[PDB]
Design a protein around this nucleic acid. Structure first.
Ligand SMILES: [Mg+2]
Ligand SMILES: [Zn+2]
Ligand SMILES: [Zn+2]
Lengths: 50, 1336, 98, 79, 49
DNA sequence: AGTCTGACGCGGCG
DNA sequence: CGCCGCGTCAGACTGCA
RNA sequence: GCAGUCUGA
């Protein structure tokens, strides 16, 4: 959706925007799992387990 | 229309001459209906009609009778514009002292009456009497006598005297005195006084009186009896839409006057008691002074805001006065502003301009093209067609801006390249698109910056924008000859990624027919961008005849560099791309292309580089992730070792074996050592990869880590920040600067915990608060430099001079800081450069030393070149184009007409925001030489120097000096002269804490004036047990002990006198205080033995070198060359005496006693040698060693500040400032010229006067040139418009008023003020016609 | 923001400030130096006289731009005359000399 | 089309002279009745003037000679 | 603000020197469209005419 | 002119 | 001890005669 | 037009 420059990271040492980017990916990877289980209409047992 | 500006005091009759009527009533307007009041501050009768061509009463309303005066009301039917030019006047009921000539130190009224200001202020404000005429009594003229001392004088001498008070008294004193007689009376008191402390005041007063009599002024004009009134359209009374009138400040300060004056005019007719008319005259005086300059008398008048009212003198001075706010820079039509955006598809000469902005800026051009093409018939019809934005308006607009440059400007315009002209490409957004390569020149980054766009209207302005200011003409920096259009941080990463190589890349080893096959192989996917490959490459070489010769051969390349060869123009070699191209390699590639091929191939090459770098950085996918910041696995070990060491230091402090000082210092030192080990382990882990080669073996290559590639390219960041991402942040500092002893052992990939982060914030906010407050210092220094140097222009092709400074490579110890090539590239030689094989001229006299001549200098290894410079240039009012050198931005000799002063000031003040706020170990191998030597061969055979200003240098195989050190007094060196040395050898040794006095020739020591207890103490220390003698100090003696000075002398074995070589004066060594001698009397000493021992930056540095400020404790220099002695003593100062062998001998120096005086009674000194150690004052350097030594000193001490931060500035730009500092001279002998003795004159004046006086064989004046700071030399110009617009405006205007000066508009600022073509550049050709058609 | 021509200030006849008042951009002191460092004397003269301060020069320039004649007739800025009046409203006789 | 005047600068060996010569010729073309010596390629009179400068067709000496000739021949048209 | 899917990479110079390159789907989905409300006043005055 | 004032900078320079 | 200076451009909002 | 405040580069 947006393309940012990597050369803005190592000069101004705001590494928190990389880790956030890696967490916001993981935090969305969970969402895309639930979005799958809600579209497969999995049981609430499996949804609750995950 | 006019050729100069004259300024003087205004006669009362002249103020009535300006005036169009007397303002008698303080009423400004009528409140019922808003017409002006009769005789008010706004009056249509006096100041002209209120509407265009209509009378105030309506009886006349059209220009049929223009020029009439109405007779119902007296208003003349003319344009209302005359309300901006017609002045009024208030007839002051009593005289009133002008506050500028009373209070603007020195007080011209005080300096003219020879009367102290603290008493004239008392007489003027009606607190004391003064006697106009004395008469036959003790009532002398300038005597002040208080009122109670006056009424007793009412009877003592009757009414024979007349004493007065107030402005009437001072006006009577001024009007009564005679100038031509008073200056004649003072000229003999000045000529007769021998204490110059009074001669200072005498020549001050004589200068003032001669200035008053030479100009047409009269003294009694410094006391207003008529007050002019500014025209009413310049103090406008704006009607507010809120049903109100918003008043000016002057309209108060005038009304406040017109009341009190009027009130006084009643008390002079009601004959009110003289106490109350005294108080009313005092109020009128202070009201007129509050009008002219508010707050000069302390508490300033404030109206209705509890905020001081604005003066007349507050209108013209300061950052908000007319000069800086409205005259020297002004708001501008045909201009716009927007946010900038990258737009990398652009060509170097064009910029994206929004359609919505380019429709507004180019509006009258569009109206013209609409009326021309018949699409409209009237400017109103075309205005409607444009505001509707019909579809034909855009087709018009695409033509209106076809070849029409626009200027783009991003503030602050720190340097010349801050304004550049591009061709507009109409884009559809609202953001100005700006080519990526010009961002470095602008200092622009796209995080929200804005730019102003200005439109050149005239054909001359469009051609100036196209030929001088277009961005394809500005690819070299004017500060130094290095490219400013340099690929930056994405192009260097693209080309770094392209040009690199990997060991087993896809398609390695194959053989390619050329770059085209490499590109085909890459895009097909059949080979990697890094495949180490053999490509047949054809490269074109410039032969001596000028044309290109092709050479074809199979180069070992990668696929990437072969692909990049397709964009490299013909004349360049292949090795320019056969390497991993960092940032510096790319800027060097562009500089090589500019030097070999010229401007047009380079402007094409830069765009091709930008396009291909962006393309292959995109193809790269170069991305930063959290795994790229690889922390070395030794870190958690290395730290846990230093954490041990501090313990075994702390347990020593708890054991008390160390003090807090060395404990703290050793803890810091071991933490810095651990920091360096961590950063070294990090970088050694990070810069190397292991990859399997074609044979299946392992092999180490340079890493492809993204963080590392951005670091190694020079694209962004550096190992100093890769350290903080992957090493440890290391020791941080306190707010005061004392670095906290436990470091941040954590980096930004790990977390800084809350304490390490809090510590980090100290330095973070120090840096931010430093940046927020040093931009002010940098801008102020830039402005001072511009205003000292604005008027320097190149005005001549050659001044024909032969002198010039000697350029040598700077050497600060073991290493060169700048080679000769950096310091002579672009300069013209002053005298023949001949080969080290003597008398064979390597370079003729007047050549511009371009790159070819410079590498010719370096291969034949010449090391010192005499070079022409602006400080040595013979041209009057300007610089010749040869004494300047190269135009740095172009690369050829400088054009006649360049404003080199503004360029110098900008090139110096632009990097200002980047500045902040014992034996000698020879390093290299070479032949050692000694210079300025006074030496002896000691009894141990080794060399012992007994000079103080001798130096020790190293000479390589080629004859060039590679390193240089300073060998102090008493230094004993273990080598010989001319002796070849290897690396690391210590050559010279000395005692850093003591000076030994050295035997000249062998013989017996013999003590003279050595009476014990009175001059000497024989002592021994229980720790040493050895006997010694110490000479009694000044505190160790009473009167009678200072009288007898101890001494030693050498007496040979027959009891006869031995003589130091060179003269028959005896071999005496006079003993100083606290001289510690270990040796005994009667012993025979040898030549070379030590007789006795005597023990011992940033931006403000540049602002203090240019302001030529005297250091706190200056090094004392020897005033003349001669023989040292000490005449007399102890009245606070010891009187050194240098008696030469020739001329008038006696010279004296009252040197403070406490100052460590490193010279003795017997040795000689030359003119300007150091008598006492310390920082030299620049004035003394100039006085004693010439202008060349002071320009060399200032150039070197400024470049030591700039080189510390990596800043590059060609030092022409510094000499240009020094030339403007030492611009004044002082007459030491008048000669047959008209200048009086000791008077400071302009140097060009006295030099041309000497020229014309030697034209007829007479004697010409002689001078001592001065050195002034940039502020004092700015305020001492011949122009009062260049010095009144700079700063200190009231000083400059009062001194130019009482002097009657004349500004002849010869500078750049004077012509910017008045709206003329500056004499620089494309106005220069104009400004010469104006001279060659008006001087004839 | 952009402005070809608009309202002007009252004492000094220079343009107004800011896109609320239809602006006109300040060609400050450092930009005048940047033009002086080039030889752009004609660009600078038009920035001083006919774009802002000259009151007759700017109308002549507008009619010229419309008429396809890109030529200025620059006179003296109105601020300089304002400065002369303000210095003459002190007791100081500043005067242009021919 | 014109992107750099470096070619026109060697012909008129000064940059502050190129501006004045090119502006004089461009005004001859823009408000005089004069026609370009190079083919007008949809350029402005400034760029046409520079393209004339760089081909040796125009400099201050040629402009002065041509203005002198036209002044004399128009003074000749007096019957 | 909004959660945008960012990639960290240089793209043809459109993210040069702190610039940001946004896909058209961020404009289509109105993710960053904001509403601004301006107050304009028309004050009827009493004038002497 | 009474403040139920403000001051609460700094560094050269003359 | 008093006087003189202490970066540039820009946008917004109040309250004021 | 000014003062105050905030903000941007
Ligand atoms: Mg920015
Ligand atoms: Zn009338
Ligand atoms: Zn010279």
């Amino acid at each position: 959706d947006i393309v940012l420059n990597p050369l803005g990271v190592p000069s101004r040492m705001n590494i928190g925007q990389i880790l956030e980017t890696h967490l916001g990916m993981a935090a969305k990877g969970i969402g895309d799992k639930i979005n799958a289980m809600l579209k497969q209409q999995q049981e609430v047992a499996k949804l609750r387990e995950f | 229309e006019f050729d100069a500006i004259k300024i003087a005091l205004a006669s009362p009759d002249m103020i009535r001459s300006w005036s169009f009527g007397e303002v008698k009533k303080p009423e400004t307007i009528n409140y019922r209906t808003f017409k002006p009041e009769r005789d008010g501050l706004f009056c249509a009768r006096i100041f002209g009609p209120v509407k265009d061509y209509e009378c105030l009463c309506g009886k006349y309303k059209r220009l049929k009778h223009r020029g009439v005066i109405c007779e119902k009301c007296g208003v003349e039917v003319t344009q209302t514009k005359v309300r901006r030019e017609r002045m009024g006047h208030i007839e002051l009921a009593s005289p009133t002292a002008h506050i500028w000539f009373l209070k603007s130190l020195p007080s011209r009224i005080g300096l003219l009456l020879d009367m102290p200001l603290r008493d004239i202020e008392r007489v003027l404000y009606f607190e004391s009497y003064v006697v106009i005429e004395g008469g036959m009594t003790n009532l002398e003229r300038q005597q002040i006598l208080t009122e109670e001392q006056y009424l007793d004088a009412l009877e003592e001498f009757g009414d024979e005297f007349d004493a007065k008070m107030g402005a009437e008294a001072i006006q009577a004193l001024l009007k009564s005195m005679d100038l031509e007689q008073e200056c004649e009376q003072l000229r003999e008191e000045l000529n007769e006084t021998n204490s110059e402390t009074k001669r200072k005041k005498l020549t001050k007063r004589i200068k003032l009186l001669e200035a008053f009599v030479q100009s047409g002024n009269k003294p009694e004009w410094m006391i207003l009896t008529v007050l002019p009134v500014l025209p009413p359209d310049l103090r406008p009374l704006v009607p507010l839409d809120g049903g109100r009138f918003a008043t000016s400040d002057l309209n108060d300060l005038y009304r406040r006057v017109i009341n009190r004056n009027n009130r006084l005019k009643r008390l002079l007719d009601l004959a009110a008691p003289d106490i109350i008319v005294r108080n009313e005259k005092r109020m009128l005086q202070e009201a007129v002074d509050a009008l002219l300059d508010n707050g000069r008398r302390g508490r300033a008048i404030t109206g209705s805001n509890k905020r001081p009212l604005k003066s007349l003198a507050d209108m013209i001075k300061g950052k908000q006065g007319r000069f800086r706010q409205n005259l020297l820079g002004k708001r501008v039509d045909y201009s716009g502003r927007s946010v900038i955006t990258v737009g990398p598809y652009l060509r170097l000469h064009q910029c994206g301009l929004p359609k919505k902005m380019a429709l507004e800026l180019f509006k009258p051009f569009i109206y013209g093209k609409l009326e021309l093409r018949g699409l409209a018939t009237t400017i109103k019809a075309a205005k409607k067609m444009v505001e509707r934005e019909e579809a034909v308006v855009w087709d018009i607009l695409d033509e209106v801006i076809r070849e029409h440059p626009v200027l783009l400007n991003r503030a602050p315009t720190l340097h010349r390249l801050g304004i550049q002209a591009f061709e507009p490409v109409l884009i559809e957004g609202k953001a100005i698109q700006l080519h990526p390569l010009v961002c470095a020149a602008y200092n622009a980054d796209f995080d929200g910056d804005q730019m102003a766009v200005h439109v050149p209207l005239t054909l001359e302005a469009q051609l100036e924008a196209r030929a001088l200011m277009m961005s394809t003409n500005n690819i070299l920096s004017p500060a130094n000859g290095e490219p400013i259009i340099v690929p930056s941080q994405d192009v260097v990463l693209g080309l770094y990624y392209m040009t690199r190589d990997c060991v087993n890349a896809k398609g390695e080893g194959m053989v390619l027919t050329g770059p085209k096959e490499a590109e085909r192989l890459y895009r097909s996917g059949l080979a990697s961008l890094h495949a180490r490959v053999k490509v047949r490459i054809t490269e074109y070489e410039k032969d001596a005849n000028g044309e290109l010769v092709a050479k074809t051969s199979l180069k070992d390349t990668t696929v990437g560099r072969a692909i990049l060869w397709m964009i490299v123009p013909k004349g360049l070699p292949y090795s320019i791309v056969n390497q991993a191209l960092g940032k510096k390699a790319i800027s060097k590639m562009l500089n090589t292309c500019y030097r070999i091929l010229g401007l047009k191939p380079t402007v094409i090459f830069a765009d091709q580089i930008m396009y291909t770098g962006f393309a292959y950085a995109a193809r790269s996918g170069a991305s930063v992730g959290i795994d790229d910041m690889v922390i070395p696995e030794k870190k958690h070990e290395i730290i846990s070792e230093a954490e041990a060491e501090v313990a075994e230091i702390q347990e020593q402090f708890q054991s008390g074996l160390v003090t807090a000082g060395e404990r703290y210092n050793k803890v810091i030192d071991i933490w810095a050592a651990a920091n360096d080990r961590v950063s070294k382990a990090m970088m050694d882990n990070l810069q190397t990869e292991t990859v399997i080669n074609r044979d299946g073996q392992e092999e180490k290559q340079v890493s492809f880590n993204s963080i590392y590639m951005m670091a190694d390219s020079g694209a962004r960041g550096s190992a100093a920040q890769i350290r903080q991402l992957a090493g440890m942040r290391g020791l941080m500092a306190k707010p005061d600067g004392s670095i906290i002893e436990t470091p941040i052992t954590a980096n930004f990939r790990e977390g800084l915990n809350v304490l390490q982060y809090f510590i980090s914030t100290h330095g973070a906010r120090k840096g931010l608060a430093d940046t927020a407050l040093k931009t002010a210092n940098s801008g102020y220094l830039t402005r001072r430099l511009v205003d000292v140097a604005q008027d320097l222009v190149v005005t001549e092709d050659d001044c024909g001079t032969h002198e010039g400074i000697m350029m040598t490579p700077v050497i600060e110890g073991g290493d060169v800081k700048e080679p000769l090539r950096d310091r002579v590239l672009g300069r013209v030689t002053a005298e023949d450069v001949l080969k080290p094989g003597t008398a064979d001229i390597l370079v003729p006299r007047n050549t511009l030393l371009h790159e070819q001549w410079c590498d010719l200098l370096e291969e034949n290894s010449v090391d010192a070149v005499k070079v022409r410079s602006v400080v040595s240039c013979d041209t009057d009012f300007g610089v010749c184009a040869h004494c300047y050198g190269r135009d740095l931005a172009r690369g050829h000799i400088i054009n006649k007409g360049e404003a080199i002063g503004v360029i110098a000031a900008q090139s110096i003040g632009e990097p200002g925001t980047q500045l902040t706020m014992s034996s000698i170990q020879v390093k290299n191998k070479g032949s050692i030489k000694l210079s300025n030597v006074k030496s002896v061969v000691n009894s141990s055979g080794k060399l012992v120097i007994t000079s103080r200003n001798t130096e020790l240098k190293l000479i390589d195989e080629f004859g060039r000096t590679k390193e240089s050190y300073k060998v102090p007094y008493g230094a004993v060196l273990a080598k010989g002269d001319g002796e070849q040395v290897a690396g690391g050898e210590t050559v010279a040794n000395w005692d850093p804490h003591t000076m030994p006095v050295i035997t000249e020739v062998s013989g017996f020591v013999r003590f003279t004036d050595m009476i014990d207890g009175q001059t000497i103490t024989r002592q021994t220390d229980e720790l040493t047990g050895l006997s010694s003698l110490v000479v009694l100090d000044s505190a160790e003696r009473t009167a009678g002990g200072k009288d007898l000075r101890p001494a030693l002398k050498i007496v040979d074995a027959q009891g006869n006198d031995v003589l130091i070589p060179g003269t028959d004066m005896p071999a005496q060594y006079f003993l100083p205080g606290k001289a510690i001698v270990q040796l005994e009397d009667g012993v025979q000493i040898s030549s070379g033995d030590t007789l006795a021992r005597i023990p011992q930056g940033g931006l403000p540095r540049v602002a203090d070198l240019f302001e030529a400020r005297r250091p706190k404790e200056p090094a004392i220099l020897a005033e003349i060359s001669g023989i040292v002695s000490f005449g007399k003593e102890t009245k606070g100062k010891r009187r050194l005496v240098i008696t030469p062998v020739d001329g008038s001998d006696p010279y004296e120096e009252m040197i403070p006693k406490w100052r460590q005086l490193n010279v003795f009674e017997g040795e000689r000194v030359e003119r300007g040698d150091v008598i006492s150690d310390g920082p030299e004052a620049p004035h003394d350097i100039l006085r004693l060693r010439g202008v060349h030594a002071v320009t060399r000193y200032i150039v070197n001490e400024v470049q030591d500040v700039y080189r510390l931060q990596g800043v590059k500035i060609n030092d022409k730009h510094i000499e240009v400032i020094v030339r403007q500092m030492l611009r004044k001279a002082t007459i030491v002998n008048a000669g047959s010229s008209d200048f009086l003795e000791g008077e400071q004159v302009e140097y060009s004046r006295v030099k041309i006067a000497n020229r014309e006086l030697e034209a007829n064989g007479k004697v010409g004046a002689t001078y001592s040139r001065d050195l002034l700071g940039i502020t004092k030399a700015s305020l001492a110009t011949e122009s009062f418009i260049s010095a009144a617009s700079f700063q200190e405006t009231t000083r400059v205007l009062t001194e130019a008023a009482v002097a009657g000066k004349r500004d002849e508009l010869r500078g750049l600022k004077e012509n910017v003020i008045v709206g003329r073509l500056i004499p620089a550049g494309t106005g220069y050709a104009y400004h010469q016609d104006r001279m060659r058609r008006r001087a004839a | 923001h952009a402005r070809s021509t608009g309202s002007y200030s009252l004492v000094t006849q220079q343009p107004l400030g800011g896109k609320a008042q239809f602006g006109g951009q300040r060609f400050g002191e450092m930009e005048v130096w940047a033009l002086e460092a080039y030889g752009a004397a004609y660009t600078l003269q038009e920035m001083l006289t006919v774009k802002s301060d000259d009151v007759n020069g700017r109308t002549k320039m507008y009619k010229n731009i419309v008429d396809g004649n890109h030529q200025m007739e620059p006179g003296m800025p109105e601020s300089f005359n304002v400065l002369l009046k303000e210095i003459r409203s002190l007791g100081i006789n500043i005067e242009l000399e021919d | 089309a014109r992107v750099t005047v470096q070619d026109a600068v060697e012909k008129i060996g000064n940059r502050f002279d190129l501006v004045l010569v090119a502006a004089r010729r461009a005004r001859q073309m823009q408000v005089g009745g004069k026609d370009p010596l190079v083919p007008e390629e949809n350029d402005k009179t400034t760029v046409i003037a520079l393209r004339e400068i760089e081909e040796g067709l125009i400099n201050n000496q040629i402009l002065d000679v041509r203005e002198r000739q036209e002044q004399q021949e128009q003074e000749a048209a007096e019957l | 603000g909004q959660n945008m899917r960012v990639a960290f990479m240089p793209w043809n110079g459109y993210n040069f020197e702190d610039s940001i390159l946004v896909s058209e789907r961020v404009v289509q989905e109105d993710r960053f469209t904001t509403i601004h409300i301006q107050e304009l006043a028309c004050v009827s005055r009493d004038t002497k005419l």
